[PDB]
Design a protein around this ligand. Structure first.
Ligand SMILES: [Mg+2]
Ligand SMILES: [Mg+2]
Ligand SMILES: [Mg+2]
Ligand SMILES: [Mg+2]
Ligand SMILES: [Mg+2]
Ligand SMILES: [Mg+2]
Ligand SMILES: [Mg+2]
Ligand SMILES: [Mg+2]
Ligand SMILES: [Mg+2]
Ligand SMILES: [Mg+2]
Ligand SMILES: [Mg+2]
Ligand SMILES: [Mg+2]
Ligand SMILES: [Mg+2]
Ligand SMILES: [Mg+2]
Ligand SMILES: [Mg+2]
Ligand SMILES: [Mg+2]
Ligand SMILES: [Mg+2]
Ligand SMILES: [Mg+2]
Ligand SMILES: [Mg+2]
Ligand SMILES: [Mg+2]
Ligand SMILES: [Mg+2]
Ligand SMILES: [Mg+2]
Ligand SMILES: [Mg+2]
Ligand SMILES: [Mg+2]
Ligand SMILES: [Mg+2]
Ligand SMILES: [Mg+2]
Ligand SMILES: [Mg+2]
Ligand SMILES: [Mg+2]
Ligand SMILES: [Mg+2]
Lengths: 25, 83, 66, 181, 116
RNA sequence: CGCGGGGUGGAGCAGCCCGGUAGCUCGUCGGGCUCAUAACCCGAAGGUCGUCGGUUCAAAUCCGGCCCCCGCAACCA
RNA sequence: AAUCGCAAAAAGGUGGGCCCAGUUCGGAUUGGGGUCUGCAACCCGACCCCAUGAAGCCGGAAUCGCUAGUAAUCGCGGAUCAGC
RNA sequence: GCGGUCGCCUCCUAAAAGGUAACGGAGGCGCCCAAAGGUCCCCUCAGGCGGGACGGAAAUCCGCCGGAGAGCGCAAGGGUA
């Protein structure tokens, strides 16, 4: 959920990047 | 958690007075206003008086307070329960 | 012992982090124990694995040189 | 079965190392093991015997003896309990059958205790006997985890012929008892 | 089958059945899988006794878990309190340790309301 | 000092026979409706049972002593 | 700076996994290890990673919004601004 | 008169046999048990200390100490391992 910083959707919500949402297009 | 490292920030005015107390070897009450700084292992055994905004509180020092700051031992609260 | 009303109790086998425990002498011969800490695994044969005592020491060395 | 690894280890290992350590003039003076009493305090079964037989089922499976069902000596309100009612389960295992039981207790059970850094070195009752309390009946090899319905431990009372527990300590030590020093 | 201390997981899957251990999360689990060379997709319900023992020894030896971990945590807290640390005397009062506002929404750490 | 009935949340009442769990109304507290208070609606807290001893496994409850309350009696003289 | 960069749009779409489980739901709290801004993150910053996994299974009396590209739902940007 | 009492058991009063009075000091009975009965065989308490998961003053267990202070359906007495 948008509150689980340990996931894709969570990371998007906060607007940041990391292991669970890497910067790679 | 928490971090800042690759610097380990400690104020001078006390660090100088702490060192100047190891050489000559003299342990005495040392008043400070710097709670922004880390502690020891060169202060271990000194009674530094930390400031809580109101007045200096004498704080014993042991080798397990090392990693922390000085303010963590001089609370700014005064609570004493409710009701 | 009284006749009937009893478990058989018979020479048995056993398994662990070790290899084998022939002794046994119990009902249901041949058993697979999670970890017999008698063979040498765990605490005895004081392994002290995943050793510790970071605490002071840890913040000490990342401090002496930071 | 009159072999048993521990029964062997007592005579040809423990017994001699005990003599040269205390200097027993006679042959009998040296501490022998006798009588190991296992007792489940089971108030858990106040008004339901159905749960008391499943326990006995279990106790005999790990010991090799059907246990006797103790009954309440007196009526004691506060926590129910009147002069009757099955309020406990107890079995007294002696020579041989005690040996095979005490062996698995050391080489399997205790090892399976979550945590465990040794048994209490103060449970000696002064006159040279040792008591210990277990917190669940799954640490014994005979138990399958799929036969349980609820966790219930027990009291274990080991009795020794040793007049002092200073000596009673050595016996249990040399037998392979994991003490917390 | 029993792994750390005890804790018997089962069915569902293998990468999740490891999470049910105290000290193991999505990472530490999904890692030891391809480090002991085993397929997570399968269920602990079915797997060679061999695979079973690679796990227990790997995991139970790689790090500390269940009892050992818990024991270390409560041990760090004891120190924080023992020393007079603010971060520590917020453990005596059972209040939120990391900043936050206690004027309100502090329940989780403060407990159900005691209306007055 | 005769006889009878009592004493239980803050108020007034049950529960005591027959043992084993204390209930009702009001009030109090928190929230709601209202511009607002009350009414009204939704929630919650609160009594060791006058007292000391006794009986029983267990006492508001059965038994005894003491202290208070109410009622009746104190006649021939 | 339509001539570079923030920039990935998100839901959607395809494929696959979970199979009703306080559960790969939910991410609170907490332990540990770090990054960055700033003279300085104890009180009092944000962020990452490991572990922890909380209350919550749809909310009493009450009560709000909205008539169409509206309500719902999805992401993006800006001001302030060292960071937040 | 009013009040209390009226038969039965226990204790004291009762003066070391029995018995013995008073509106003398205190309690209890108007049942109960098909086993709480007969016999044979076994068994021995209460407490106190130490020991032992959930067990707490006290549930069940082990150790030593424990002549009866326990128990004997209910009062008291006598009796009794
Ligand atoms: Mg949503
Ligand atoms: Mg999630
Ligand atoms: Mg200067
Ligand atoms: Mg905050
Ligand atoms: Mg009345
Ligand atoms: Mg009243
Ligand atoms: Mg009545
Ligand atoms: Mg009301
Ligand atoms: Mg109100
Ligand atoms: Mg009275
Ligand atoms: Mg009686
Ligand atoms: Mg009373
Ligand atoms: Mg007349
Ligand atoms: Mg951006
Ligand atoms: Mg819940
Ligand atoms: Mg989850
Ligand atoms: Mg559900
Ligand atoms: Mg309109
Ligand atoms: Mg935004
Ligand atoms: Mg900004
Ligand atoms: Mg009359
Ligand atoms: Mg006489
Ligand atoms: Mg006794
Ligand atoms: Mg005792
Ligand atoms: Mg005791
Ligand atoms: Mg008697
Ligand atoms: Mg009698
Ligand atoms: Mg008598
Ligand atoms: Mg007598």
């Amino acid at each position: 959920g948008k509150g689980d910083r340990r996931t894709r959707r969570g990371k998007i919500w906060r607007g940041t990047y990391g292991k669970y949402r890497p910067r790679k297009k | 958690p928490r971090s800042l490292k690759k610097g380990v920030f400690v104020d001078d005015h006390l660090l100088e007075k702490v060192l100047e107390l190891n050489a000559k070897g003299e342990k005495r009450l040392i008043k400070t206003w710097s709670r922004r700084s880390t502690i020891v292992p060169e202060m271990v055994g000194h009674t530094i008086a930390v400031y809580n905004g109101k007045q200096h509180v004498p704080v014993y020092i042991t080798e397990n307070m090392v990693g922390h700051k000085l303010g963590e031992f001089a609370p700014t609260r005064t609570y004493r329960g409710h009701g | 012992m009284k006749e009937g009303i009893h478990p058989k109790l018979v020479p048995a086998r056993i398994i662990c982090g070790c290899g084998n425990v022939i002794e046994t002498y119990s009902t249901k011969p041949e058993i697979y124990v999670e970890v017999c800490s008698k063979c040498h695994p765990f605490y005895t044969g004081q392994q002290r694995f995943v050793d510790t005592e970071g605490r002071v020491e840890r913040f000490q060395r990342r401090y002496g040189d930071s | 079965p009159l072999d048993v690894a521990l029964k062997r280890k007592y005579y040809e290992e423990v017994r001699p190392e005990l003599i040269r350590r205390f200097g027993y003039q006679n042959v009998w003076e040296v501490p022998r093991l006798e009588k190991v009493v296992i007792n489940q305090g089971l108030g858990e079964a106040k008004e339901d015997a159905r749960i008391l037989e499943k326990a006995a089922q279990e106790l005999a499976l790990i010991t090799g003896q059907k246990p006797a069902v103790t009954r309440a000596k007196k009526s004691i309100s506060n926590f129910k309990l009147r002069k009757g009612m099955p309020i406990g389960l107890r079995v007294t295992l002696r020579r041989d059958r005690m040996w095979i039981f005490l062996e698995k207790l050391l080489n399997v059970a205790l090892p399976r205790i979550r945590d465990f850094r040794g048994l209490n070195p103060n449970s000696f009752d002064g006159r040279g006997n040792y008591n210990l309390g277990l917190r669940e009946q799954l640490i014994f090899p005979e138990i399958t985890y799929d036969m349980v319905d609820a966790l219930r431990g027990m009291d274990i009372a080991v009795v020794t012929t040793a007049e002092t527990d200073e000596e009673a300590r050595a016996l249990l030590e040399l037998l392979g008892f994991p003490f917390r020093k | 089958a029993r792994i750390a201390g005890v804790e018997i997981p089962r069915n569902k899957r293998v990468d999740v059945a490891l999470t049910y251990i105290y000290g193991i999360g999505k990472a530490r689990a999904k890692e030891a899988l391809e480090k002991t060379g085993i397929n997570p997709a399968t269920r602990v319900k079915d797997l060679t006794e061999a695979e079973v023992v690679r796990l227990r020894e790997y995991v139970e030896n790689t790090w500390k878990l269940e009892g050992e971990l818990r024991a270390e945590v409560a041990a760090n807290i004891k120190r924080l309190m023992d020393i007079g640390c603010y971060r520590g005397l917020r453990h005596r009062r059972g209040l939120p340790v990391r900043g936050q506002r206690t004027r309100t929404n502090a329940r989780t750490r403060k407990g159900p309301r005691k209306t007055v």
